[PDB]
Amino acid sequence: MQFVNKQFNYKDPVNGVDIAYIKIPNVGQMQPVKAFKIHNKIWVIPERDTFTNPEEGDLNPPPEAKQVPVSYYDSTYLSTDNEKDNYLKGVTKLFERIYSTDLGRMLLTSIVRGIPFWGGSTIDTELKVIDTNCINVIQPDGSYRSEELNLVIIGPSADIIQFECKSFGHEVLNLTRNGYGSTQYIRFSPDFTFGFEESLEVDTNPLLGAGKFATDPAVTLAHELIHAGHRLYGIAINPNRVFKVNTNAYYEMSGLEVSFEELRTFGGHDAKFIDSLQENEFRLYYYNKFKDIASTLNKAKSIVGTTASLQYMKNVFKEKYLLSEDTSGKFSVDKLKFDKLYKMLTEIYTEDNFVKFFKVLNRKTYLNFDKAVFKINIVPKVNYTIYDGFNLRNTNLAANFNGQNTEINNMNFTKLKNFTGLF
Numbered sequence: 001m002q003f004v005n006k007q008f009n010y011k012d013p014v015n016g017v018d019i020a021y022i023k024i025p026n027v028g029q030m031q032p033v034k035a036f037k038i039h040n041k042i043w044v045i046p047e048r049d050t051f052t053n054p055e056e057g058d059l060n061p062p063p064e065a066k067q068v069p070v071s072y073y074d075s076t077y078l079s080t081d082n083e084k085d086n087y088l089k090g091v092t093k094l095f096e097r098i099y100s101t102d103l104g105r106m107l108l109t110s111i112v113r114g115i116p117f118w119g120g121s122t123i124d125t126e127l128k129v130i131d132t133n134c135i136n137v138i139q140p141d142g143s144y145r146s147e148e149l150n151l152v153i154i155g156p157s158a159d160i161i162q163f164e165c166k167s168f169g170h171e172v173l174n175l176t177r178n179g180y181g182s183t184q185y186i187r188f189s190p191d192f193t194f195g196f197e198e199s200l201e202v203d204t205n206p207l208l209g210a211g212k213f214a215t216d217p218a219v220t221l222a223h224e225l226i227h228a229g230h231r232l233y234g235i236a237i238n239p240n241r242v243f244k245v246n247t248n249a250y251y252e253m254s255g256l257e258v259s260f261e262e263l264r265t266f267g268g269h270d271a272k273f274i275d276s277l278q279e280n281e282f283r284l285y286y287y288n289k290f291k292d293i294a295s296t297l298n299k300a301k302s303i304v305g306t307t308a309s310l311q312y313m314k315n316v317f318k319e320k321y322l323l324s325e326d327t328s329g330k331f332s333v334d335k336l337k338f339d340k341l342y343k344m345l346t347e348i349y350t351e352d353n354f355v356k357f358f359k360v361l362n363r364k365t366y367l368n369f370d371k372a373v374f375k376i377n378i379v380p381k382v383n384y385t386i387y388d389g390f391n392l393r394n395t396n397l398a399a400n401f402n403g404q405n406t407e408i409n410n411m412n413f414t415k416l417k418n419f420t421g422l423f
């Protein structure tokens with residue numbers, strides 16, 4: 001089976017269904033951009049993100065006031081039709097690489113089922129969608145139609161290497177932290193990757209290493225998808241909750257703090273830096289939020305719109321949050337099933353676990369220091385494949401992660417900027 005059933009070309013004609021010009025609602029005035037629906041509830045926009053934030057409507061570098069040492073700027077990237085064509089084929093290839101593993105098939109399944117909650121109504125008895133969880137699709141007659149969706153993969157903004165999740169908020173609800181969920185816009189590029197060091201002492205030192213080994217972009221995309229899974233189920237930890245690193249002398253010499261959301265997303269040894277009493281506080285919180293979702297679904301006898309029934313809409317949220325249906329017809333939250341789903345989204349879907357499935361070399365911890373950024377081209381099968389990534393089987397790159405070795409497989413990587421020593 002395949003996740004993306006159509007090998008899209010960027011120059012394919014629009015059809016108003018899965019190849020169409022779309023608009024982002026409630027952003028500011030924008031021109032419709034060509035988008036591609038690679039899967040149910042998942043779209044891809046091969047353009048630089050100058051929309052989701054009215055602040056960053058400029059691809060040129062800002063005045064170095066809030067600028068990061070780990071940054072890279074190129075206003076011309078992803079501006080030609082050939083670039084957008086390779087971007088679409090690159091993102092397509094990475095989704096199939098993730099889907100080729102059991103862990104990736106489970107994560108992508110949970111993302112599709114993670115429909116943002118229909119809690120937009122100010123009247124308790126009526127269920128209504130939240131407007132900022134859809135896009136406007138131009139139909140073959142020039143008219144717009146709204147279509148719900150969970151995920152959007154879009155190009156980066158001014159800083160090319162800052163892959164960030166972006167979602168539209170609410171002045172009444174924290175949709176990413178109240179269990180509701182929201183449509184997630186992921187800034188990502190398959191044409192760049194980062195270099196890391198193979199020894200833990202060198203990788204976690206800010207003064208050593210040039211980035212001998214390159215990160216598999218499938219791991220990078222999965223890492224962002226894990227964040228999107230947390231936000232689509234509304235169980236993301238507030239970024240204010242941080243772990244002030246005491247395990248790295250260079251971190252505390254500058255007072256660097258890392259959010260619990262990042263430590264949870266990486267998994268492995270990093271996840272246990274979140275102490276057990278605070279993790280219990282988080283789980284009880286999201287458990288309560290799930291019951292109010294069960295309560296508002298119980299106090300709902302109506303629905304707004306003619307695109308779905310109330311029984312279907314009550315059903316899809318029962319499948320999403322794994323609620324229990326009693327004999328009276330009202331939903332409840334089983335603690336055993338909540339702990340089951342919460343652990344799947346937080347402990348099973350981790351970067352460290354995806355490394356084990358991909359059989360790749362990767363950073364051992366989120367508490368390291370970036371080394372370099374490379375330009376890559378994963379679309380040609382002679383460079384990168386679904387089942388092997390860079391470590392192509394039956395070649396000299398198969399063993400010892402030789403494909404990720406930028407000194408052995410030098411023709412596949414072009415170093416653009418060094419980060420070592422600039423801290």
Ligand SMILES: *SCCCCCCC(=O)NO
Pocket residue numbers: 163164165166224227228262
């Ligand atoms: S959608 C992810 C929310 C936090 C953005 C930080 C970028 C990141 O994930 N770095 O590893």
Ligand SMILES: [Zn+2]
Pocket residue numbers: 223227262265
């Ligand atoms: Zn992250």
